[PDB]
Design a protein around this ligand. Structure first.
Ligand SMILES: OC[C@H]1O[C@H](O[C@H]2[C@H](O)[C@@H](O)[C@@H](O)O[C@@H]2CO)[C@H](O)[C@@H](O)[C@@H]1O
Length: 408
């Protein structure tokens, strides 16, 4: 990878130009090309391209995926003096800490909130169960109650989790890597509620990120579930919008997974020296954040000096309310598998393709398995077994036939 550039990948829903403004200031001072890019599904791409001349120097993602990448030795260790570490809240350092080493620089705390249209809904609903009633209402008025991305379990998870669904059990400060609360009763109850919305045409399993965004912005649905990055496009559509706590289900709080947006450094990179300089000296400063937060919000930020300001903004105050009630994502390498399972479990359940009981039954077993790396060789084994057992039945039958034809 050409030394004396910085190539940065960051997800497209994020303030990608805000950050590219920061790579200008850097270029001004250092005279270094900073190239911000946003390829679709970077979380999946990075590991394929890492150790190559087309790897990124820096990669932005929530902390969850980084332990994955860390295990595979794709991230360089970051070694910043404690004076610096004191600039940002510790718990953010905690998120990017794997086998006691730091692997990314924390940037932003992200939690989904309930974004609602203050016109169509003067009062937004305090509970999930209120919502079918509020669709009857707005179905009539040509509108819809609620629309959020079903195609990512990030958004579906707060509901599942709400009656004590969990990914991997935390006990003795470690994650019990074979104990998984996807197919537990409250998780089952969570998903069953959501399928019942789809069953009763109160929501539509088609719904992708784009559509949900269109609908709320174009004033067609009273509610979405999203994070602060979404906020900038809704300002634009001048939709009078509030940003509140997600509603209780079975009178328990919605428990979103809380990502920490984090900037890891490609262990392949020659510019690890520069990468650190950029992130510490330019991005993680009240200037370089304000540069992004203006483009598309970071929501709540790792950097304390700035977050002190942003906290007053009662949207970011509501974002932290949701987080407080939710849970920080594990950063274990198993999360990749867990995510895949639940994506599919929720798809299948909402498409009808599988019962709720059946979908989570699988996600359980598949998440506990640890890796999506075995699906091919597994499915091949499974056929091999199926085809054998069929052969066995076939033989039972030729034998029983052959015995009837000797009794004659
Ligand atoms: O949907 C599963 C998905 O959840 C998380 O991804 C979030 C994350 O908080 C942000 O990076 C933001 O861009 O939106 C994403 C949701 O689509 C996990 O970080 C990710 O691994 C997982 O695939």
């Amino acid at each position: 990878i050409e030394e004396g550039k910085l190539v940065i990948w960051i997800n497209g829903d994020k303030g990608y130009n805000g950050l590219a403004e920061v790579g200008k200031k850097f270029e001004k001072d250092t005279g270094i090309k900073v190239t911000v890019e946003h390829p679709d599904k970077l979380e999946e791409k990075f590991p394929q391209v890492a150790a190559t001349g087309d790897g990124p120097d820096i990669i932005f993602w929530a902390h969850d995926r980084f332990g994955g990448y860390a295990q595979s030795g794709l991230l360089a260790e970051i070694t910043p003096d404690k004076a610096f570490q004191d600039k940002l809240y510790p718990f953010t350092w905690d998120a990017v800490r794997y086998n006691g080493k730091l692997i990314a620089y924390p940037i932003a705390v992200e939690a989904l909130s309930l974004i609602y249209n203050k016109d169509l809904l003067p009062n937004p609903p305090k509970t999930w169960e209120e919502i079918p009633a509020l669709d009857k209402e707005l179905k009539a008025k040509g509108k819809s109650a609620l629309m959020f991305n079903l195609q990512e379990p990030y958004f579906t998870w707060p509901l599942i989790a709400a009656d004590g669904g969990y990914a991997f059990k935390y006990e003795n400060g470690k994650y019990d890597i074979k104990d998984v609360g996807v197919d537990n009763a409250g998780a089952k109850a969570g998903l069953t509620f959501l399928v019942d919305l789809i069953k009763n045409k109160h929501m539509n399993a088609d719904t992708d990120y784009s559509i949900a965004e269109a609908a709320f912005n174009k004033g067609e649905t009273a509610m979405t579930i999203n994070g602060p990055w979404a906020w900038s496009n809704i300002d634009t559509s001048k939709v009078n919008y509030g940003v509140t706590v997600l509603p209780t289900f079975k009178g328990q709080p919605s428990k979103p997974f809380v990502g920490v947006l984090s900037a890891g450094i490609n262990a392949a990179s020659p510019n690890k020296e520069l990468a650190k300089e950029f992130l510490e000296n330019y991005l993680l400063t009240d200037e370089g954040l304000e540069a992004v937060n203006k483009d598309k919000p970071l929501g709540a930020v790792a950097l304390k000096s700035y977050e002190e300001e942003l906290a007053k903004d009662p949207r970011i105050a509501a974002t932290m309310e949701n987080a407080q009630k939710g849970e920080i994502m594990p950063n274990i390498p198993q999360m990749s598998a867990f995510w895949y399972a639940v994506r599919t479990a929720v798809i299948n359940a909402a498409s009808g393709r599988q019962t709720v009981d059946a979908a989570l039954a699988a996600a359980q077993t598949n998440a506990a398995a640890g890796s999506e790396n075995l699906y091919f060789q597994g499915m091949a084994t499974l056929e091999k077994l199926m085809k054998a057992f069929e052969s066995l039945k076939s033989f039972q039958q030729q034998q029983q036939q052959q015995q009837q034809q000797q009794q004659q």
